[model samples]
Target: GHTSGTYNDSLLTINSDYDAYLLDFPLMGDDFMLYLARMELKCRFRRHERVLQSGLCVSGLTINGARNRLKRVQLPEGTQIIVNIGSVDIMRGKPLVQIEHDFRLLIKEMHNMRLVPILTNLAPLGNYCHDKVLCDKIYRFNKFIRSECCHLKVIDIHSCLINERGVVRFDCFQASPRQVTGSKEPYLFWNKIGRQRVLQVIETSLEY
Candidate 1:
């Protein structure tokens, strides 16, 4: 089981009085992120209501490169920007303190630019049922965002995607196809139930 990308402007419409733009580095999950947004656009959000939105790329992104990316974006002052940068930094052993500092800087910059910045904690890694070490890093990082950062809004979509078993819901991803009889699986991205939970939390977060 593998994972992929977030909520961004590419998911919703071009104009939104209550807009949310998901920003991150390149990712295979990125396309799926946009697709879920489009699905939510049509199924959940009316074409005219508060739009969920963002970029669509299968590229890589990290906090170190965040500011440079923002330099080129033309986001509106009051629009919301949801930051979904990669969790690889934690996987690769970036210091928790450094990650928090960089993230704080990112939001600081977005605030100065007048874009309200929101943070999404990283998704669970590789069926974290027995993967406690992976969970540790993710928890540390997510906790940093939740409490360490000042004046930032955080979303717990990560919690929504994982089950009580402490694993990302097996049904959440588009698992590899099976060849045997009666074998079926989902698409490569968040499936219907997964996306619904995600959008539900997001709409709740962005609503007020």
Candidate 2:
């Protein structure tokens, strides 16, 4: 069967303590090597409870910027910086930033520094899905995944389908969970339109 796009423009937000900084470049994904270049970092200092209580304690940061600016910091190396900038020094702790020219190379240099990069995208090509012939497609696909890729966990169903953005480019899927009918037949019902969200339920031995 053929498909037509029907989706609403919706905003999805992820609650995060760490703020996000945005930078855009065409074909950034294709040039994975660009992650090797040196860059500047700027940080706004915010103290923790330990520093807040003491007002003048000696604590430095073991900070590294994340691809999406979400990363974990460990100590000794964690104290990579000595707070020399800014004037908010009560001295309980030092909020410092650890700089790196090549974040990709730095990761390779520091075996202990582990980073999980989140490549969040709003591109239509990265957003797609294969709708089932019927809701039965879900069941059939789930059965297929269970027999394969048992070692890998299907953490998320990255919706590559449904263009809720309604952009005229590649048609993206905007399938939502609440609208699924499991009806086993196709019809032009508004309730049937949505982005595919079935990956968490399926496991596969091989790639599709």
Candidate 3:
């Protein structure tokens, strides 16, 4: 069995192992430490993939499992990270439905080989917020502070906005499917609620 308090329903919890791995283990130097770290989490999911207080998509992928969404983790271009699946977690809400199903298939494939793929959270970066309205309406949302848990006030997405990208673009969409060829550092943006919304929408589409 996987770690406890990790998977809730079919959606994985925020700041889970998978997300933590991605954040902690960036493809830094090509030493044994970096190489072994990548190998360890290569088939495992990382936490930065989970939903957070903000509503932004955390997708940083490349070949060789080097690229990561965590800002602190840096890797050269051309790195690739593979998505692995373990068991299916349904009740996970919607935005993650598509990827969740895809993960199931991946797990099934791995099962045939007697291997286990790391399962990522089905919810987005911001799934921690209990308030549905703020998460639903990107412009009108609040932070789910760990200290306060679910008793805090609603905060606008503008506070989390990085540049002029606007709240909508930040919480709802991916800037580009592909990573920039050459950049000083890895891209880092978080949206806990937005991830849930996206997963929910993905689930609804499968109804057809």
User: Quick one: best lDDT, which candidate?
Assistant: 1
Q: Each candidate's TM vs. the true structure? A: 0.64, 0.18, 0.22
- Native-referenced Cα lDDT, model 1: 0.55
**Deviation in angstroms for 133 in model 2?**
32
For candidate 3, the 10 contiguous residues with the lowest summed lDDT are 82-91
Per candidate, the number of residue pairs that clash is 13, 27, 42
lDDT tens digits by residue: candidate 2, 105-177 = 3334333443222222111222112422322333333333333324323222223323355332232222322
Candidate 2 regions exceeding 4 Å error are: 1-72, 75-112, 115-159, 162-208
Runs with alpha carbons beyond 4 Å of true place in candidate 3: 1-97, 120-208
**Across residues 76-170, which tens digit of lDDT does each residue of candidate 3 receive?**
33322222111111112223334334433433443444432222221222222344543343221112121221221112223332235322345
Deviation in Å, model 1, residue 119 alpha carbon: 2.3
lDDT of each: 0.55, 0.21, 0.27
**Residue 190 in model 3: lDDT:** 30
Residue 125 shift from truth in candidate 1, angstroms:
2.9
